[PDB]
């Protein structure tokens, strides 16, 4: 979850 669930 490197984008913290904000983007693909």
């Amino acid at each position: 979850n490197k984008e913290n669930c904000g983007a693909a």
């Epitope: 979850n1 490197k2 984008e3 913290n4 669930c5 904000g6 983007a7 693909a8």
Partner: antibody, heavy 113, light 111 residues
Framework: QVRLQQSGAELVKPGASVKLSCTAS????????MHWVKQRPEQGLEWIGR????????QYAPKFQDKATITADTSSNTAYLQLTSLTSEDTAVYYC???????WGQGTSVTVS | DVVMTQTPLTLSVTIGQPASISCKSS???????????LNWLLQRPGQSPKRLIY???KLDSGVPDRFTGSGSGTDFTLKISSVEAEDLGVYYC?????????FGSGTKLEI
């Protein structure tokens, strides 16, 4: 507490080139994607691009592939935004943000005089 | 690029009243991986933006449950059950399904 500390306001002449910095506290930037976002009072928010501090891979919005250069340094846990050939439009507040725009820095206000 | 259209653009309301903000995208934000990367930001006056909602309906830490995110595909809505002083500012929806990341033009909530 997680903090994204950005460098101070820049007041520069048309044609120069500034380099903004974003020092992260409370997490490791290599575990995230570091983003940069531009904001103008009328035009609104514009995604500049994104960097993976773990490898250095960058992705830019086509509008800024030319203008902006995003770098990162894991040793100082800091991300950077370099802007070339600043014009009157480049006058804006520039934000850094961690993965998925979860948390943002206080922003660095650039003024092109 | 994905165009994010927010309505209304400005919202002047009384303290305690509910609020509803629309967010429409030019294409589907349902990613092939099966998740919809539509998010909501709040930027208080003089403050920096902050994420309120992610994955259509998930609330970020600290966000009051007066906020509820909903919708699917291209049509999304942010609702506030009761507007408080801390809820004033500009709300931005944005998508992370397709790159480049794009933002709505923002909805100004004031009294």
């Amino acid at each position: 507490q997680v903090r994204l500390q950005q460098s101070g306001a820049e007041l520069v002449k048309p044609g120069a080139s500034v380099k903004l910095s974003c020092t992260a506290s409370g997490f490791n930037i290599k575990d995230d994607y570091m983003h940069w976002v531009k904001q103008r009072p009328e035009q609104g928010l514009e995604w500049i691009g994104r960097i993976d501090p773990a490898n250095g891979n960058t992705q830019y919005a086509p509008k800024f592939q030319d203008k902006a250069t995003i770098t990162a340094d894991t040793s100082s846990n800091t991300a950077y935004l370099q802007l070339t050939s600043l014009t009157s439009e480049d006058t804006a507040v520039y934000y850094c943000a961690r993965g998925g725009l979860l948390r943002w820095g206080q922003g660095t206000s650039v003024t092109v005089s | 690029d994905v165009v994010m259209t927010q309505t209304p653009l400005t919202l002047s309301v009384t303290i305690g009243q509910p609020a509803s903000i629309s967010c429409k995208s030019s294409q589907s934000l349902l990613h092939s991986n099966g998740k919809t990367y539509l998010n909501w930001l709040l930027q208080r006056p003089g403050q920096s933006p902050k994420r309120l909602i992610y994955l259509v309906s998930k609330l970020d830490s600290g966000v009051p449950d007066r906020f509820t995110g909903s919708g699917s595909g291209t049509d999304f809505t942010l609702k506030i059950s009761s507007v408080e002083a801390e809820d004033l500012g500009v709300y931005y929806c944005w998508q992370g399904t397709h790159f480049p990341i794009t933002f709505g033009s923002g909805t100004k909530l004031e009294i």
